[PDB]
């Protein structure tokens, strides 16, 4: 009847429990220790200025109403117990659209220690907004941020803290890289405060430093442009008594340059300035025209 005693413990634990009130509502500030494990770093959409990321989001706090004594020191409970207790309402400030996976069941986790400490872990995918500056494209680097914090709880009520040393609190899996066009140089974390129109909120920030790989653009744009420039200049060595041949050379080289210039931009967002690739294509077009 070990199940019976554990059921009795759980029933005594939720008796007279108001999940609408945070622990230490009027007499203490709730401190949520936070930890992120990145199981994969999804692709980066240059056109949409966003990036996908899969994580285990781990949150731990202390709830004094959930102290218990029994034959166990921890209670590994089914994830529907979390809906019966207070949990922090963390959200991602620069999140565009995220999903909390629930196949085949809600991908959630709740451990209660006998001293009242809780561990609450979720698996979720976040599409986050990463503003990009493409003046040095395709030789540019970016620091894509991930900002989260509490909705509706100001700094005076809920604060967030890294569970371990800040430099060790965001861990990226070894094989978890879905980056095709970029290279993940490392990650950085920080903590701060943002003043909103509803109060002062703690914000936890992570910065992922990404370096773009130039190879694709080399092969796809730079080599064709250099080749077209070489081909245009090859027309000089032809005899002057062959007007049709040199005319064909010039016109076809110009047409190829125009096609390449139209093609190159199609990969990038419609920014209002010229990138390094744009300058290279412009100079190649100038040489062909000359």
């Amino acid at each position, epitope marked *: 009847d070990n199940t019976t005693v554990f059921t009795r413990i759980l029933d005594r634990l939720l008796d007279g429990y108001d999940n609408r009130l945070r622990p230490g509502l009027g007499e203490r500030v709730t401190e949520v220790k936070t930890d992120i494990f990145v199981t994969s770093f999804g692709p980066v959409s240059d056109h949409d200025m966003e990036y996908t990321i899969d994580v285990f989001f781990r949150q731990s706090w202390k709830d004094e109403r959930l102290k218990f004594k029994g034959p166990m020191t921890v209670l590994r409970l089914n994830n529907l117990m979390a809906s019966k207790i207070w949990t922090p309402d963390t959200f991602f400030h620069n999140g565009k659209k995220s999903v909390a996976h629930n196949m085949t069941m809600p991908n959630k986790l709740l451990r209660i220690t006998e001293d009242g400490t809780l561990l609450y872990t979720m698996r979720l995918t976040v599409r986050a907004e990463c503003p990009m500056h493409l003046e040095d494209f395709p030789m540019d680097a970016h620091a894509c941020p991930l900002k989260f914090g509490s909705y509706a709880y100001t700094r005076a009520e809920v604060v967030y803290e890294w569970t371990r*040393e800040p430099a060790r609190s965001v861990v990226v899996a070894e094989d978890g890289s879905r980056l095709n066009q970029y290279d993940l140089l490392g990650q950085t974390v920080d903590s701060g405060i943002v003043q909103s129109s509803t109060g002062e909120y703690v914000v936890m920030t992570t910065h992922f430093h990404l370096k773009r790989k130039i190879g694709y653009f080399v092969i796809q744009t730079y080599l064709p442009c250099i080749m077209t420039v070489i081909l245009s200049q090859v027309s000089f060595w032809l005899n002057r008594e062959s007007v049709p041949a040199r005319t064909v050379f010039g016109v076809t080289t110009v047409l190829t340059m125009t096609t390449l210039s139209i093609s190159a931009r199609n990969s990038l967002p419609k920014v209002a300035y010229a990138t390094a690739m744009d300058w290279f294509i412009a100079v190649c077009y100038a040489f062909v025209f000359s």
Partner: antibody
Amino acid sequence: VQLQQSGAELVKPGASVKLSCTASGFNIKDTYMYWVKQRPEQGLEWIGRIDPANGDTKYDPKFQGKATITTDTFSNTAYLQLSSLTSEDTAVYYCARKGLRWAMDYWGQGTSVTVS
Amino acid sequence: NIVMTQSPKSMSMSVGERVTLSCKASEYVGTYVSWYQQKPEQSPKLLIYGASNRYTGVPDRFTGSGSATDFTLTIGSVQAEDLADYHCGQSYSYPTFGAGTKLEL
């Protein structure tokens, strides 16, 4: 709110010392406990760190092996076991508590350890 | 580790003047540097946590600033009880402390 350390003690070179740090007013399981070394007219030096709830420890690379840190959740105390003492181990050893963005808010009075 | 280069090594200033202590971080530490005041034969006392956050019971003249690698602690209108050592430490990684800064009159 209060961290009480053991009193000073004189030992001989090559001996072993086990310092004590008693926490009153809070549970050590709730935070990390730090041990810091201060030689005279010098800056502070982090010795190591322990997480009482898990028991795992981290040490400075220049103190690894020499020092051992342990706690006792029952008595709410932390220990620092120094081994193979040398003349340069004369200093004041502090016990500190992590809090509010890893700032080491509370410190012990310090123990003066000297080896003759 | 992360080396915290604290300057100047020492400094004297009369009572009523403004002083600025500076601390340099080797690598990036974000806003995870704290300032400690250690009076003679006493244990250190936390003054500033985060990077600009006065600990409870800290007078309003003390104030910190800085981010990334550069940090500073400006004591405006120092009094006679502000004579002590001032250590800067980073807690971004395993803690390291600056060599210290002695304040005389």
